[PDB]
Design a protein around this ligand. Structure first.
Ligand SMILES: COc1ccc(-c2cc3c(C)nc(N)nc3n([C@H]3CC[C@H](OCCO)CC3)c2=O)cn1
Length: 879
């Protein structure tokens, strides 16, 4: 139609490839995902059309609230008798006069209540009903829901900062006048035997093509469930280099009905010299998306080995053929049985599980042989019930012995009483034994829900089973707040890579939330779009992006304006670091200024939302405040006017650093971990102010960085002014009076926060230029080069003098680092889980579980609470 043709050009621009291309794809799964996902779209749109227009407003401007309405002790204490002084603004008459009405009201007042007092003060300022809404002055953040005022992140941040909230009052009708009439349309594309196989698995390696020049070669194979072999790996015969025809059947120690649902064939072409090397790799799901077992002739196009691969295989790697067909192509053959073999229905598995529990009970009783895996009733002693608990308290990095596994499995029915043990019991299963797997399925089917922070662990590369991942999704669906879903969004987008198929419970969950919360949808779009360059995820992420863009609504027009901006800056910074690299900042700036005269450039680089915070409107480009930086990759310091009616009450200008050349993924993760550490310390009552500024990767070593206003590096404070006493005097000068005592306190609390953080994460070398200080004393670190692969933030005499060595303030400071280290140690399981989910991300500083182990060392998990306290105590004295 007319609208369908306009939509597809808009979707195409957003993804970076035309939609017609997805149709010219003959994979039934691709076309099934495309059609079968459409109900997740339908449900999301329906929820937005439910309480229209209010429900459409909640979509476009979701309330930005904290997870709990409860405030910590140190936060509540800042309120003058549990009450907050709030400032409500009104835009009066035709001359748009800003008029403030100050209040002092209960921090837990709902926005409809706050409005009432503001109308009461307006009616009294001389001596209406609820057709109004509250907005943050200077940004598009609204207060459309009945939450305690202190629950909104702006209000809580204000309390924390000792800043007075500035909110603007406006008509509900004036906001709804900005929400357009969106319509969802149905696209043009929308309109056996089971365990009866009494046989062992064999796979024929026929031949290899596109394998030529540059001693011998072979095909290394293995059958895997996650990253664990379901039997021993089987190699083909060694063969001369250019001639690769094996025509060999490989015979595996697995009986076909014993194959788990998420069983994979993991293969690689290896070179020999004593020194075996993988040339290419590829993995195949033994069952297709429809539960059908792979049969017959097949050809798999192979992938290049990832930089820094362990063994000769890549089990954690992507499944399916490499799209580039000019690559090593391996031709295989699978046994064809009586008909089309299909994995049994849940009911057949349910009956076999009941049969297995029965045969298990009458097995021994009447066996004669010994079994450490048979379940025994009444034989569970209180000293071993307390030993089972000690297992559940173990970190995800800790090794679980074969004895502990047999122990855990014989107690599989008790385990249901310690629900947080499940990841360990799931590892304890003999995943190559249909008998135990059918039984495990029924346990999960009725397993007590676990916390989302625990659920997430069952979504890394170790838990491939659809039932295990389905239960994890179910725990998130019911217990994960939007605040928290937003906080862990980069790991949830990352673990999508561990999914066997396009259509799954996780993608369905993530997409429903994306299409019912625009703040989630923004970052869901950007985290997906930023990996379109990566061919390993291009199709899955592209299809996910198509389904998103097809139902997001008018936000696509906003996303496309953002895409056009980043594309211009990439083009711009390409020319500077290529051609005009050694040219002066005046000539380089003359080129930018000449390019800004161009219409396509002055439309693109102005009047669009900030990808770091879509609540921020980037108006006119103030070139006069922009500069090409001195850094090697020629990054841009960019300055935009804040076109908000009340910009002045937040920030009149918005500064973003656009960088093209370096990987921002490692900074993205370090800044996320900081936000988390900060939120852990804050929840535990100890106020250690951190600054996880915005950093977003938009592609292949391209991204944006939030500039922190009123900040200078440690070097800049030393330089303009060898010198070791300048910092304190500068902070005394920038905070003279009673204002000084607050600044010294904000420097120590922030200085303590970064001391712990950097130590734990093993962050890159911290110097005078890698550290920064705000006008109020707030200390923060920047450019986190590389983590894990020592105390990097060495407290020099410079920082020590600002603290007040044998002082009362330094005795308070040490007590700040100590509680903080204990606070992170009590949460090490979460941090371990966040890094594990990122293994799939191609990050060099995080390629194996060995890398994550660094935080088991620095957080002394194998030691005790007092022992680890002694570890941090000892490591902090060595400077
Ligand atoms: C991963 O890549 C990167 C690249 C840049 C930054 C980066 C962040 C930053 C922030 C958040 N806030 C403020 N205020 N400044 C900042 N800077 C400035 C440092 C001083 C410099 O001054 C000129 C040379 O001395 C101007 C730039 C940065 O570089 C961080 N990570």
């Amino acid at each position: 139609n007319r609208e369908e043709k306009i939509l597809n050009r808009e979707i195409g621009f957003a993804i970076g490839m035309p939609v017609c291309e997805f149709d010219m794809v003959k994979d039934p799964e691709v076309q099934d995902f495309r059609r079968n996902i459409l109900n997740v779209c339908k449900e999301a749109v329906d929820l937005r059309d439910l309480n229209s227009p209010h429900s459409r407003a909640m979509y476009v401007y979701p309330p930005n609230v904290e997870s709990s309405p409860e405030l910590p002790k140190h936060i509540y204490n800042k309120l003058d008798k549990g009450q907050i002084i709030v400032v409500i603004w009104v835009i009066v008459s035709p001359n748009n006069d800003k008029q403030k009405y100050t209040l002092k009201i209960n921090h837990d007042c709902v926005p409809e209540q706050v409005i009432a007092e503001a109308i009461r003060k307006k009616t009294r300022s001389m001596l209406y009903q609820g057709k109004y809404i509250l907005k943050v002055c200077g940004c598009d953040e609204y207060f459309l829901e009945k939450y305690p005022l202190s629950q909104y992140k702006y209000i809580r941040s204000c309390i924390m900062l000792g800043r007075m909230p500035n909110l603007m009052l406006m008509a509900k009708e004036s906001l709804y006048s900005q929400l357009p009439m969106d319509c969802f349309t149905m696209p043009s594309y929308s309109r056996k035997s089971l365990w009866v196989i009494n046989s062992a698995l064999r796979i024929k390696i026929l031949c290899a093509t596109y394998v030529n020049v540059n001693d011998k070669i072979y095909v290394r194979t293995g059958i895997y469930h996650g990253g664990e072999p379901l039997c021993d790996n089987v190699n083909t015969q060694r063969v001369p280099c250019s001639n690769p025809r094996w025509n060999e059947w490989l015979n595996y120690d697995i009986y076909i009905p014993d194959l788990p649902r998420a069983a994979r064939l993991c293969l690689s072409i290896c070179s020999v010299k004593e020194e075996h090397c993988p040339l290419a790799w590829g993995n195949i799901n033994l069952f297709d998306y429809t539960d059908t077992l792979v049969s017959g002739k097949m050809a798999l196009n192979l992938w290049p080995v990832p930089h820094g691969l362990e063994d000769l295989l890549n089990p954690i790697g992507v499944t399916g053929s490499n799209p580039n067909k000019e690559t090593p192509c391996l031709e295989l053959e699978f046994d064809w049985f009586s008909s089309v073999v299909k994995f049994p229905d849940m009911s057949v598995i349910e009956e076999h599980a009941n049969w297995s529990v029965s045969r298990e009970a009458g097995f021994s009783y009447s066996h004669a042989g010994l079994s450490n895996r048979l379940a025994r009733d009444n034989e569970l002693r209180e000293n071993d019930k307390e030993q089972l608990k000690a297992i559940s308290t173990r970190d995800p990095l800790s090794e679980i012995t074969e004895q502990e596994k047999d122990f855990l499995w014989s107690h599989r029915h008790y385990c249901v009483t310690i629900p947080e043990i499940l990841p360990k019991l799931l590892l304890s299963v003999k995943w190559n034994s249909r008998d135990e797997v059918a039984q495990m399925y029924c346990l999960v089917k009725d397993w007590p829900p676990i916390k989302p922070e625990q659920a997430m662990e069952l979504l890394d590369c170790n838990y491939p089973d659809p039932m295990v991942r389905g239960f994890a999704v179910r725990c998130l669906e019911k217990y994960l707040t939007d605040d928290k879903l937003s906080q862990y969004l980069i790991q949830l987008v990352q673990v999508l890579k561990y999914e066997q198929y396009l259509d799954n419970l996780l993608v369905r969950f993530l997409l429903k939330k994306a299409l019912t919360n625009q703040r989630i949808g923004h970052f869901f779009f950007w985290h997906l779009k930023s990996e379109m360059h990566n061919k390993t995820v291009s199709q899955r992420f592209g299809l996910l992006l198509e389904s998103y863009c097809r139902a997001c609504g008018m936000y696509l027009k906003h996303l496309n304006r953002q895409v056009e901006a980043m594309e211009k800056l990439i083009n711009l910074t390409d020319i500077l670091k290529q051609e005009k690299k050694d040219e002066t900042q005046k000539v380089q700036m003359k080129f930018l200024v000449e390019q800004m005269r161009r219409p396509d450039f002055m439309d693109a680089l102005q009047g669009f939302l900030s990808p770091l915070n879509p609540a921020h409107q980037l108006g006119n480009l103030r070139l006069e405040e922009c500069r090409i930086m001195s850094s090697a990759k020629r990054p841009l310091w960019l300055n935009w006017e804040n076109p908000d009616i009340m910009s002045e009450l937040l920030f009149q200008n918005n500064e973003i650093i656009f960088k093209n050349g370096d990987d921002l993924r490692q900074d993205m993760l370090t800044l996320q971990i900081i936000r988390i550490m900060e939120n852990i310390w804050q929840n535990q009552g100890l106020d250690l102010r951190m600054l996880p500024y915005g950093c977003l990767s938009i592609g292949d070593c391209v991204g944006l960085i939030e500039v922190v206003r009123n900040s200078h590096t440690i070097m800049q404070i030393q330089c303009k002014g060898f010198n070791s006493h300048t910092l304190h005097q500068w902070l005394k000068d920038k905070n003279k009076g009673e204002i000084y005592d607050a600044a010294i306190d904000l420097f120590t609390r922030s200085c303590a926060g970064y001391c712990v953080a950097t130590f734990i994460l093993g962050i890159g070398d911290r110097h005078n230029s890698n550290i920064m200080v705000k006008d109020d004393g707030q200390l923060f670190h920047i450019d986190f080069g590389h983590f894990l692969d020592r105390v990097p933030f060495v407290l020099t005499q410079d920082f020590l003098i600002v603290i007040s060595t044998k002082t009362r303030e330094f005795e308070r400071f040490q007590e700040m680092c100590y509680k903080a280290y204990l606070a992170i140690r009590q949460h090490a399981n979460l941090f371990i889980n966040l890094f594990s989910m990122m293994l799939g991300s191609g990050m060099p500083e995080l390629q194996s579980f060995d890398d994550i182990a660094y935080i088991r060392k620095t957080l002394a998990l194998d030691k005790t609470e007092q022992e680890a306290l002694e570890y941090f105590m000892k490591q902090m004295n060595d400077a």
